[model samples]
Target: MSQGTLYANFRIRTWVPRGLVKALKLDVKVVTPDAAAEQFARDFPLKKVPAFVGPKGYKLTEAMAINYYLVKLSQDDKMKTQLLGADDDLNAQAQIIRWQSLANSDLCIQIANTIVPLKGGAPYNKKSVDSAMDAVDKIVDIFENRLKNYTYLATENISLADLVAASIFTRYFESLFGTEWRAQHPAIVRWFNTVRASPFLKDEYKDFKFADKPLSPPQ
Candidate 1:
């Protein structure tokens, strides 16, 4: 029997949980939000994707929590501890969560603020996009500082921090952060290259392409 049904639709947030389903080899059935429209609406009226309905109708929302649960479901204990942090190391656990939170919150939100408007998904405002770009640059500076000192975020191993953060960063690489910007951030580029090539996330980048130039707002 399937352990659960995961409704994954939101692009930025969905990657990790969907990858977790495959990486952990969980028996969860991955369904698109539209595929399970009625049931999904009934369970989660908010229409949030990357939501989960586990056995006996145990429902879960939020990408981070769902991803954590899926990782915990893995039989490989060492891998779990590496990706998630150990009981003996509270700092590492905190750091893992820290990076994930920073990316999921500020980084993701700002990138969307910049990109959505450029793509005409939302009303474009020069001040708003510029503000978002500045915010993203500051956040990436933080990431570059940490990654420059260490190969990975949160720990030496490829942890959930790396997965979640890199997943969120994918949007910038695809649209806002182009070749020139990338050239200036070697540390981020290096870390992103390493993390995205990992088994946990390699599949997500198969068709990924970096934009030659950042998207410009319409005149």
Candidate 2:
């Protein structure tokens, strides 16, 4: 029997779970919400992407929770430890979540705050956008500094932290981090390249294009 079904789309938030379904080769069917509209709406009225429906009618929402569950479902013990941290290593486990939270919430929120306005998805306000950009710089600096010394985030091997954080960073590479900015942040670029090249996320960025210049406010 199939392990379950996963609802995912092209949105960045769904990227990790979608990749997990393939990378881990879970017996989960991947479906877009639209394809399963009525059923999905009935199961999860929130309409959140990256939702999961496991065997025995088990359901899950939230990328972090879904990701942890999927990883646990993997039969590879070593991989589970590498990706999720060993039970004895409480610090690594906490650090993994810390970095994930940093990228998922703090960084992504700021990136959207800046990009949404610049792209006119929301009202473009100089003060708000600039403020968000400043926050982005501060948060990115955290990643930059840590990556300078570590090959991956929160662990020696690629972990949930690296996958989640790099997925969130996709927005910046696509819009905010231009050639000059990228040049200045070689550490982040190096880490991002390494993480994205991992089997879990390699396919997700196949069509990614680096922005030559950062998005400028609309005239």
Candidate 3:
């Protein structure tokens, strides 16, 4: 029997978890809330994308938790070996979750603060945008420092850390961070290429175009 449905809109974070539906052969069906609006409300009162309703009406929220569950369900020991490190490696699991939290929290907030105004979704506020950019630069530095010496984030191979970080970073790549930023942070640029190319993320980044140069620096 199918694992029931995942209620997610077409947001980037949602895409990260949804990609696992295919790569991990998770039995859930991907459906927007509009697919059954009332049912979606019943299951996910907050209407957050990436929420899940298992066949037995089981409920789940949070992209990280959902992605982790689906990965475990895949039961591909080798994949888990490559991702979360040893099943019993509590330290590695903490690191993986750390990256996930940092990206989705710090990186995401800064980008949203900066990019939303630049895209004219919100009124431009130089003070706010500049503050956010400062935060983003610091966050990128963290990734830059680590990736300079390692091929992956949490383990020897791709893990949920890189997966989630890369997914969230796409907005910055597409909208804010550009040629100069890329040049300054070569390690992150290099690391992101592999993350972008991960087979699981095909749907979120199809025919993507990165910023050649960032928009006129909020001048």
Candidate 4:
């Protein structure tokens, strides 16, 4: 198989999924955010990082979509069955998708709303931040209840659901690791620690540091 090259930013949005892909050990090349933006502008004409170029110049963008494709590339049948589930597992896959979408659309947006202001992207909106956090809490509660019964989401094994969901949570973990934010979700804490400690996860996440204080919006 031909190795793929990934264009990525250093942010959690890029690294989390990239971490999973790296775990699979598919031959990959990573271009930093600045290089990615320039290359994507030339190749894709949209200037999006997190883009991918595969054999024969096949190209793709969007983080989630790229993740699914990479998993298919790296894993064998048993692994895929574990990660993707069988046809009989459609309902479970759908649920996994539901959680993933909720995390990305609501939880991630909320964190970004707060963090971006700290990074100086825009003025902070406390109302927006609060509402987003509420939504995240609700979703986290749902996962907490479900995880109390099952070790992983979807099937009895890790699936795209778990990987994708964890990718989003890693952002919060980086920002809120030692704070009161983690105390509310024991299941999340347990699951995330296991995920983070996994060999594949460990390799990709070698030098991360949780923020000591919320970053102010960039000047």
Models 1 onward score TM values of 0.92, 0.95, 0.91, 0.80
- Stretches of candidate 1 exceeding 4 Å from the true structure: none
Report residue 102 deviation for candidate 2 (angstroms): 1.3
The collision pairs in model 2 are none
Query: lDDT by residue for model 3 over 91-210, one digit each (tens)?
Result: 888888788788878788876688788877777888878888899888888888999999887777888889889988888888877887888889888989988778778767888888
**Candidate achieving the largest TM-score:** 2
TM for candidate 1 is 0.92
Ranking of models by lDDT: 2, 1, 3, 4
Runs off by more than 4 Å, candidate 3: 217-219
133-161, model 1: which lDDT tens digit per residue?
Answer: 88888888999999889999899999999
Per-model tally of clashing residue pairs: 0, 0, 0, 7
Q: For residues 51-148, could you state the per-residue lDDT of candidate 4 as single tens digits?
A: 88898899998988877777788756666666666657787667767767766775676666655554557777667766655776777777788777
lDDT of 2: 0.89
- Which scores higher on TM-score, 1 or 4? 1
* Global lDDT of each candidate: 0.87, 0.89, 0.82, 0.68
